[PDB]
Structure formats: C-alpha cells, structure tokens
C-alpha cells in the first residue's frame, strides 16, 4: 500500500516538473525526505543523476536498468540495498557515485562491485575500528576512478588511492581542520592534475606537491601560509597554469613571483598582501586576476600589461585610480571594483570595449563618466551602479541603453 501510495503521490509528470540539473549540467532528481524510491522514478530512461537523500533503508528494484543514461548517483544519509541486475547495469553504465554518510552502516557493501566507476566523492568519516579505509577496501576493484573527493575528517591517506592514481586525476580531501601525514607517499600521482587541499592547515608545502609534473590547479586554501616559498622548484613541472592562492594568511609576495609568465587565472584573493608589485605583471599569459579582500595600498599602472585578461577582481582593497594602461587592454569583462576608495576613473576608459560586469555600490566615484555608459557588452545586469549618477548622464544615452535592453 505504501509503495502504491508512493507511486500515486509521486507520478512521472510531477517528477518531470521537479526535474532539475546539477553543476555538471546533467539531469538530476533531488528526492528529499522520502520513504522510498517510487517506481515512477525508475520508469524513466533518460535519467543520468539519481540523487537519493535521507531515505530509510530503501531497496532498489531492478527497473533501474531502464534508466539507460544513468551515470551519477548521490547517496546522502541513505542506506541503499541493491540487487544483481541493478549491479549489472551499473557495472556497464554507471561511472559516478557520490556517497554522503554519517555512519559506517549507511555505506553499502555493493558499491565496491562496479566495473565502470570513474567519479567518486565519499563524504563522512572513513576512519574507524577495523574500518579505517576498510569500509571502502573495494576501491582496488575500481580501476577507472578519476575524481576522489573525501570530506571525511581524515588523518592519513591510503596507499591504494596512490595505486589507483595511475588513472585518477583529482583528489580533494576535506578534513575540517585535521592534518594528514603525507610522508611523500603521493608521488604515484602521475595522472593527477588538480591537487586541492581544502582546509588542510598545512602551513608548509611538501616536496610531493612540486614533484608531480601534471599538477595544474594548486589552491592551498585556509592552510594559513604565513610565507609561500616553494614556487621556485615548480619549473620542473611544465603544466602549472593556475595558482589560485586564496583564503590564506599570506602576508607578502616575494618579488621572485615576477619570474613566472605562464599563469592565466592568478587568483590571489582573500589574503593580506600589502601592495601588488610590478613584478607580478611580468606574467603575460594572465587571463583572470582576482585580488579580493587585500590590503593593497594603491593600484599601479602595470596592471595594464594584461592584454588577454578577461575578469579582474581587486574588490575590498584600498585602490583610488585605474590607469590608462589598464584601459589599453581591450578584453576586460568583469571588473568587480566595488567597496573600494576609488576617486575617479580617468576618461581613457573610453578605450575599453569588452566590459561586461562591474560593481560600483561603494567606492568614492563622485559622478559617473559617460564612458561607463559607452561599454556595449556592459548591460543593466552588468552595470551594477548607483542610480543618481546614472541620472546625471544625458537622457538619450540612457534611452539607447534601455532600447538595447528591451527593443
């Protein structure tokens, strides 16, 4: 009767109305506080992301094999019970498995028998008596993993992950403030490209970080680096392209940072940098620069050495003037310049063409230059601006912008 009523209350049409999409632009279904999975879910054939959230001890019927495109699977606080045809279709189709738990028994024993598993986030503590990485000891059987996110309050890394890393390319461990013992056991990360130590609180960089030649994304977020001194040994690593050093206690950048040229998305936001140097603008390949929440004394001119730069966020700084060199760069799009001490924007901003989004709530801009209205790609959604100084502009320019908005 409960299953019959579950199909009665949750119909295919209602599921289609609730059907949503995930971060990967894949068809997801968020089933929150359900007694079970209705068979109307399993009548689908195009579903790819089956998300199961807080369902007490559900039993998965074989009709999941009908969901022909099924690739992801989200288990959040859900004890899952599955059978063999389901295991077959998941061994031939399923390449992702997102397990969130607060207990060992919430983690099922079937999930280690998949023959196509590729993406895998384990959320919840995996260290226990006879169960520290022995909950999940079947991760040797999974020989195609490529992404491993571990929000587990972890203190050590298993060697078996290092063995899997021949094909694994992303390992992000969240530990809520627990230091792991690396001990240079990570050097089998030949295929790793994105080592993301979130809230690791390392305060130091081990040699295994700058020994792994394929690493391209390095963010030592919330690791309380007072000093960063290990960038010199990164030149053996030919593939580093993005140093998003954000949310850290970094007091100063040494001038040797001017030696780099190849970075694009240099995100040094949420730090304690006293001033941006001209050396940092020796990097010619920068396409994105975020310096939000810093103690920058002013904005120098050499910021205009960035021709390919697309978004620039020097938000929450102490910056008064934008130089004409910055406006020689034609590719500025997202200028998050707000909550600053900007005196004025020099009229050479008329050289700008590709401006899309700007934030000016805050600052000290006495009146809007009409050049801010000149930017074509900058629309009303992008021009987040005060209204009175917009009214100071001639009404017909405002009418032209309005007609561009509405036609």
Final resolution, Å:
4.3
DSSP element (H, E) containing 218: strand 217-219
**Structure tokens, 21:** 């999409």
What secondary structure letter does DSSP report for 344? B
Task: Please give the backbone phi and psi of residue 66, each rounded to the nearest 5 degrees, phi first.
Answer: -75, -25
Structure tokens belonging to residue 100: 């969130």
- CATH number at 1-117: 3.80.10
Burial degree of 268 (CB within 10 A; 0-12, 13-18, 19+) = buried
Provide the β-strand partners of residue 122.
99, 150
CB-based contacts of 383, cutoff 8 Å, min separation 6 = 358, 372, 373, 375
Contact criterion met (CB below 8 Å) for 295 and 318: yes
Which candidate, 375, 276, 363, 392, places its Cα nearest to that of 334? 375
**Dmax (CA) of the chain:** 75
Compute CA distances 372 → 225, 343, 356, 377, 379, whole Å: 39, 15, 11, 11, 10
CA angle 208–213–216, rounded 5-degree value: 95
Distance CA 168, CA 75 (A): 21
Selection from 48, 46, 29 nearest residue 38 by Cα: 29
So where are the chain's domains? 1-117
List residues bridging with 358 in a β-sheet. Answer: 335, 383
Distance CA 74, CA 191 (A): 26
Instruction: Indicate which technique resolved this structure.
Output: cryo-EM
DSSP H/E element including 163: helix 159-164
* Residue ranges of E strands in 37-88: 49-53, 58-59, 72-76, 80-81
* DSSP-assigned beta bridge partners for residue 21: 27
Q: Are strands 288-290 and 311-313 parallel, antiparallel or unpaired?
A: parallel
Residue 63, helix vs strand vs coil: helix
Q: Report the number of secondary-structure helices (H) and strands (E) in the chain.
A: 9, 18
Say how far apart CA 173 and CA 155 lie, in whole Å. Answer: 10
DSSP state, 300? -
Sign of the CA dihedral with 101 first, then 105, 111, and 117 last: positive
Phi, psi of 165 (to 5 degrees): -60, 0
Question: Quick check: 316 and 293 in contact, CB under 8 A?
Answer: yes
Q: What tokens were used for 390?
A: 């917009």
For residue 37, give the DSSP letter: -
DSSP 8-state assignment for residue 135: S
């Amino acid at each position: 009767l409960r299953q019959l009523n579950l199909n009665n209350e949750w119909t295919l049409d209602k599921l289609r109305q609730r059907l949503t999409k995930n971060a990967q632009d894949k068809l997801e279904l968020h089933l929150f506080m359900l007694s079970g999975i209705p068979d109307t879910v399993f009548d689908l054939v195009e579903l790819e992301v089956l998300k199961l959230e807080l369902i007490p001890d559900v039993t998965i019927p074989p009709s999941i094999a009908q969901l022909t495109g099924l690739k992801e699977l989200w288990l959040y606080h859900t004890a899952a019970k599955i059978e063999a045809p389901a295991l077959a279709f998941l061994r031939e189709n399923l390449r992702a498995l997102h397990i969130k738990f607060t207990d060992i028994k919430e983690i099922p024993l079937w999930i280690y028998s998949l023959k196509t598993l590729e993406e895998l986030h384990l959320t919840g503590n995996l260290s226990a008596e006879n169960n520290r990485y022995i909950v999940i000891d079947g991760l040797r059987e999974l020989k195609r993993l490529k992404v491993l996110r571990l929000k587990s309050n972890l203190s050590k890394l298993p060697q078996v992950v290092t063995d899997v890393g021949v094909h694994l390319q992303k390992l992000s461990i969240n530990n809520e403030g627990t230091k792991l013992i690396v001990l240079n056991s990570l050097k089998k990360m030949v295929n790793l490209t994105e080592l993301e130590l979130i809230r690791c609180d390392l305060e130091r960089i081990p040699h295994s970080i700058f020994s792994l030649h394929n690493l391209q994304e390095i963010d030592l977020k919330d690791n309380n680096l007072k000093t960063i001194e290990e960038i010199i040994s990164f030149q053996h690593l030919h593939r580093l392209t993005c140093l998003k050093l954000w949310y850290n206690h970094i007091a100063y950048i040494p001038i040797q940072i001017g030696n780099l040229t190849n970075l694009e998305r240099l995100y040094l936001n949420r730090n304690k940098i006293e001033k941006i140097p001209t050396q940092l603008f020796y990097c010619r390949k920068l396409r994105y620069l975020d310096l939000s929440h810093n103690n920058l004394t002013f904005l120098p001119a050499d910021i205009g050495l960035l021709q390919n730069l697309q978004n620039l966020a020097v938000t929450a700084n102490r910056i008064e003037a934008l130089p004409p060199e910055l406006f020689q760069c034609r590719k500025l799009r997202a200028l998050h310049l707000g909550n600053n001490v900007l005196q004025s924007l020099p009229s050479r901003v008329g050289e700008l063409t590709n401006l899309t989004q700007i934030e000016l709530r805050g600052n000290r801009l006495e009146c809007l230059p009409v050049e801010l209205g000149e930017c074509p790609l900058l629309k009303r959604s992008g021009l987040v601006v005060e209204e009175d100084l917009f009214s100071t502009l001639p009404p017909e320019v405002k009418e032209r912008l309005w007609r561009a908005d509405k036609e």
